[PDB]
Write a protein that binds this ligand. Structure first.
Ligand SMILES: *C1O[C@H](CO)[C@@H](O)[C@H](O)[C@H]1NC(C)=O
Ligand SMILES: *[C@@H]1O[C@H](CO)[C@@H](O)[C@H](O)[C@H]1NC(C)=O
Ligand SMILES: *[C@@H]1O[C@H](CO)[C@@H](O)[C@H](O)[C@H]1NC(C)=O
Ligand SMILES: *[C@@H]1O[C@H](CO)[C@@H](O)[C@H](O)[C@H]1NC(C)=O
Ligand SMILES: *[C@H]1O[C@H](CO)[C@@H](O)[C@H](O)[C@H]1NC(C)=O
Ligand SMILES: *[C@H]1O[C@H](CO)[C@@H](O)[C@H](O)[C@H]1NC(C)=O
Ligand SMILES: *[C@H]1O[C@H](CO)[C@@H](O)[C@H](O)[C@H]1NC(C)=O
Ligand SMILES: *[C@H]1O[C@H](CO)[C@@H](O)[C@H](O)[C@H]1NC(C)=O
Ligand SMILES: [Ca+2]
Ligand SMILES: [Ca+2]
Lengths: 377, 383
């Protein structure tokens, strides 16, 4: 019957295996094909290209090759510089670029052929601050990994002039093994209330150091910025009495979503991560392939065209497809998906709020930008 | 005699005239040609391409065209996304990419064919903090414009856990005309000690609002993050008693450098100045002094590589330039006294981390020098 091709560009270091993102992409396409409710008369196909991390030149070439084969969208690469380059290309040729990871939005940038499935920083920033205020903290130490961490917490960093939060800002070193001297200063400083802005792998690492340092006890409360908090091996810490709170956008309470995360798990020792948990970077890619497909269903006329980066001739159906994608609505692995009319950023979404109880990490409320917290005391 | 071609890629909105950067580039090339000490037997030529702001796709195309014509270096474009794209291309074809503006350095990025003439943020961050500590401030309000402002002041933002600075962080709105409500909060807050992290055009704008608000008086001390502080019309404020302190990397005290900045104003000031700006007309900004210095520093390297010639390279093919590796190495080793002082790059990352700043403050006479800073000495205030 009818057939439509998507492009995929996935970043990696060294060689195989496949990464989580390229896996979720393929997995979503195979699933959707078998669904008879979604794209009934339509069958999805794809080209996948692998590139080095941070080689925007290679990302450009591969994106141009794919636009030449003909594709209805490029689920372009993850990291800032390659992603900005593929987005500029996609904008010139009017093919939608689908992103799954946050990158810094420049105001005066006029690209319009992209949406991003990642929960926008502005909203996450607020939900961190909302949580801090619910715990009634007046003192807090924000610890971040790299520059861009600062940006994800700007709403929080600007609070000390409106509300009554004194706050200290510290930076992690490159390696978490180097983190004892930093943690010792926090300990002497009596900094019991701490937000860690860093990847979930960094968080697994910094917790081990915190244990060694006598800082996983009932005296300490740690808020985690990472959405992959639920991926952390928490067996070493649940009996200790520490408080760990963070957020989760992966909708694991829904039974339909649990069964999908399982089929995924089916297809390291010193990590401190659970093995075979579906991370957020990958649930988002899988959701992106669905949301875009909901749009394809509403545009049966559309077909791919072989476009050449040489020539300034855009894709006929681009403008209309891009518009359908931005209007799309979908219940996926990561809850309500809905983009912002204005900038194509996902600014409205649903978070579960999770905390460490002796039983493990469990849900204790919700957050959404219109309600603030809905804690279930 | 011998001839060498440089490439230039300059960003703009709408159409002409030429911008400061493209002008300083051309001006540097014309000057160097006439110098008989620098590149005596060598004559510089160039291709210039103009692109839209934030169109990395177009920047890629124009860079590829230039590598095809054949060029010994691309004085690639200014803004993050286009600059990162031209840098990746330049790295694959082993032609040096010369930058004049800061952009965020990703650690795990392996590009090695570039240097940056802009004074690195890490060092500027420290010199801000050094100054604050010399004024013995224990309280300070940092006001920034956009996200990346945060990064330029990270050294400062992390101080409140080592030293004894309480500090409040506020953000400007998009337009400075919208800044009264923010300034009113600072006034009620008794925030007399304030660092403005923002462009010099924003700073000219925010000062007018501060005057309106009764905040240009002896009670207020403003430290300015911008290196183009010296470009601000200061006539409205010097009689008032406010304290304005900032830094300047443009070496205006040197007589040779003053005469060069003048010849610039004559061909430039000749074209459009503005009345309601709050900037002096025809002052050479830092963005442009750096481009002009970049063309010189790179030339000092060309003098030491007479064998070198340009090759027509194709982005199609993975075949780099023979002379690239050696030229890039000569550039990173180069040393030069230009409009912006000692130029010297960091062996490690090709970033300009060691440089000399004049420290300037508003006296009734105007903006004047009151010391110096360099990363190895801290402040050398001349009391
Ligand atoms: C496809 O199938 C699953 C169950 O087999 C269903 O839950 C899902 O909603 C279907 N897709 C659509 C868009 O209805
Ligand atoms: C996106 O639009 C939302 C409405 O959902 C609006 O409240 C908000 O201002 C926009 N987000 C951003 C980051 O501008
Ligand atoms: C929070 O509560 C209100 C009603 O009390 C509800 O409308 C809103 O959807 C709740 N948030 C979530 C995520 O359910
Ligand atoms: C502060 O302002 C007064 C009056 O303009 C001036 O005498 C003094 O030199 C200034 N202080 C500094 C830091 O230069
Ligand atoms: C396929 O959609 C339904 C079957 O699910 C069918 O009735 C319809 O005619 C087909 N769609 C098109 C566009 O022909
Ligand atoms: C911290 O609070 C959580 C609720 O979020 C509670 O379940 C836990 O017992 C507390 N930690 C301890 C044991 O002090
Ligand atoms: C070229 O001449 C100018 C003055 O004419 C001088 O300042 C400059 O240093 C000269 N170049 C060199 C490297 O000697
Ligand atoms: C450049 O390398 C790092 C990063 O800026 C810095 O620590 C070092 O001191 C610099 N090297 C020199 C020679 O100044
Ligand atoms: Ca199907
Ligand atoms: Ca000459």
């Amino acid at each position: 019957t009818h057939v439509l091709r998507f492009g995929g560009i996935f970043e990696y270091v060294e060689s195989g295996p496949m990464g989580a993102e390229e896996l979720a992409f393929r997995f979503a396409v195979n699933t959707i094909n078998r669904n008879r409710t979604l794209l009934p008369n339509t069958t999805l196909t794809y080209d996948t290209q692998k590139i080095n991390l941070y080689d925007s030149f290679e990302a450009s070439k591969k994106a141009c090759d794919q636009l030449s084969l003909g594709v209805a969208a490029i689920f372009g690469p993850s990291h800032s510089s390659s992603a900005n380059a593929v987005q500029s290309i996609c904008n010139a040729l009017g093919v939608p670029h689908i992103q799954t990871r946050w990158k810094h939005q420049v105001s005066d940038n006029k690209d319009s052929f992209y949406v991003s499935l990642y929960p926008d920083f502005s909203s996450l920033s607020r939900a961190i601050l909302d949580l801090v205020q619910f715990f009634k903290w007046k003192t807090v130490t924000v610890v971040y990994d790299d520059s861009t961490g600062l940006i994800r917490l700007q709403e929080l960093i600007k609070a000390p002039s409106r509300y009554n939060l004194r706050l200290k800002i510290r930076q992690l070193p490159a390696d978490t093994k180097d983190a004892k001297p930093l943690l010792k200063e926090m300990k002497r400083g009596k900094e019991f209330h701490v937000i860690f802005d860093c990847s979930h792998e960094m968080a697994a690492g910094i917790l081990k150091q915190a244990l060694a340092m006598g800082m996983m006890t009932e005296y300490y409360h740690y808020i985690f910025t990472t959405l992959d908090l639920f991926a952390l091996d928490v067996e070493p810490y649940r009996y200790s009495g520490v408080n760990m709170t963070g957020f989760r956008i992966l909708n694991t309470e829904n039974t339909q979503v649990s069964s999908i995360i399982e089929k995924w798990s089916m297809e390291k020792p010193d990590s401190g991560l659970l093995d075979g948990f579906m991370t957020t970077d990958a649930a988002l890619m899988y959701d992106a392939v669905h949301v875009v497909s909901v749009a394809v269903q509403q545009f049966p006329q559309m077909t791919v065209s072989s476009l050449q980066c040489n020539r300034h001739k855009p894709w006929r159906f681009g403008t209309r497809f891009m518009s359908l994608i931005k209007e799309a609505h979908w219940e996926g692995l990561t809850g309500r998906i809905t983009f912002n009319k204005t900038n194509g950023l996902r600014t409205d979404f649903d978070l579960d709020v999770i905390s460490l109880k002796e039983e493990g990490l469990e849900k204790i409320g919700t957050w959404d930008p219109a309600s603030g917290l809905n804690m279930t005391e």
